């Protein structure tokens, strides 16, 4: 049972902006109470240690309650293209429609995470939209740093395009997975493929290791009530630390994080970029760079929708058994596919 | 730790010197029902379970299916043999990228004395290594009935000697789950009786402290597990399965010349607990072995040994390796890592 929320839709700089409050009494500037109860640790500041294994040990989401069950089949398979073998968690709903497929890259700061972290979210989407979904186990840094994950995405696309000449691909992902999928999409387009007709981006990293004293990383953009301000500061500060650490893992010495294929925000042209829906929390430290990305698309005359979830932080979407806003994301995506 | 998980409000009390930490499965429910994630795995227990009493089936049922591994190559996993006391014992050796000196973790997997493999808890241990920067011996110890008691025990002894002769400064933490915990506890006891003091800690995950205890006695009384009416049948059937399993496994473990009530088969029945190292026990509310674990913790505390007893509400037996299934499993990893640094 989901709430009846009065969202606010405006158009800012060509971007369709949809702001969804966490309830009908509070319009912004505080955490959703469900979220807040998870942030207790952020009463104190955190020092991110910077070792691979410790970082990875926090990137495993325990099984999310699964209401879909047998109505969607989840199986592993390997696909091969461009001399790359990439493992995918393949989701198949009942009564599959053709010529629409969703490719999804999980988050995990380029070095971690597992596709299982968002299986249940994707089962919701496949069940509603009757579309098959590729939940991809893409290459991870630093063992397989950039552009390994990108090339995996390219192989997946080639595979899909050669399998069927009529199937339309929607690319999606959360956080750093979205970043990688966006680059792969760019690369796919620069080779002449037009089969990717849509991006669904959940709080994407669009500018890894951006200036932490610049406007993309400025706490002044996150007004919040006094009692939650220390928590917000420490929370934002943790991600500031992560942003540096993760980009170091992702980018090898020969490459640079400010390049277009590492930072989609810095692409020189956005005219080939497909129609895009971005979903992100009010208090996600990556929110500003997501918004900057959206503005860039709209200015290039690409249809762009930016849904902001008030009171929400980073990485919330797969937690469909915790937040109505997660179920909402599931709905938005499904709707985008049918 | 990282991201989405509501803070659990645990309850710490001291009972007869035991530091008791009760961790509810959410902030709504305090006790007396299964955590729903556990509950959905217990459907078959609406009816009495059928145990196939043959070695091949029992062994097969002691093998955990693949668990998702978020660590990958960031912790090194090697097979090595060590030899001591004229025993060669295989170990899965876990090495993190920056290793702290001296502190080392020896772990014995569960599997009812006749079964299990170190691979059952590899991911759990990679988590522990990753957080603690400690090297870990995940030991392939002797299994019954081909190598019944005290073969596993002696394998433990051999490991300790290997480690202590390797360097004199190294501190050992012994750990294991279920029957694995039992065997490594006895080996620790033995190691101490020979005069070693290098083992400075036990981390026990739902240990079997008294194999084949009286099933009509207080350690096996269903009354000790209050639960809601809707889940009573399941609990009862689940508990009965383990009662039967307890008899069978002890039979395999204990050869005819020995006895299960002895101190080295049943650490609960040690005559003395004063050499016993500081200990942390982690066990589920609905683990059939919970009461015997509690009895052990009390004997420790009474011997003025620091004892912590973490009870995870709504959890059953053998949950810990399942780190992709239960937040409590990752919590166990965290508690262990904390105890090592």
Numbering used by the authors:
A (entry chain B): 0 to 337
B (entry chain A): -3 to 337
Could you share sentences copied from the article?
Here, we present the crystal structure of the carboxylesterase LpEst1 from L. plantarum WCFS1 at 2.05 Å resolution. This structure revealed that although LpEst1 belongs to the bacterial HSL family of enzymes, as otherwise expected from its sequence, it represents a novel topological variant due to the presence of large and specific structural features that decorate a canonical αβhydrolase core. Additionally, the esterase forms dimers in the crystal and in solution through an association mode not observed yet in any other αβhydrolase enzyme. The structural homology found with enzymes from the bacterial HSL family permitted the straightforward identification of the catalytic machinery of LpEst1 as a classical catalytic triad with Ser174 as the nucleophile, His313 as the general base that deprotonates the serine hydroxyl and Asp283 as the residue that increases the pKa of the histidine imidazole ring.
According to the analyses with PISA and PIC servers, the subunits within each dimer generate an interface area of 1130 Å2 and interact via 19 hydrogen bonds and 24 hydrophobic interactions. In summary, taken as a whole, these results demonstrate that LpEst1 is a dimer despite the relative low overall interaction energies calculated at the interface and further suggest, that the apolar interactions are the main driving force for dimerization.
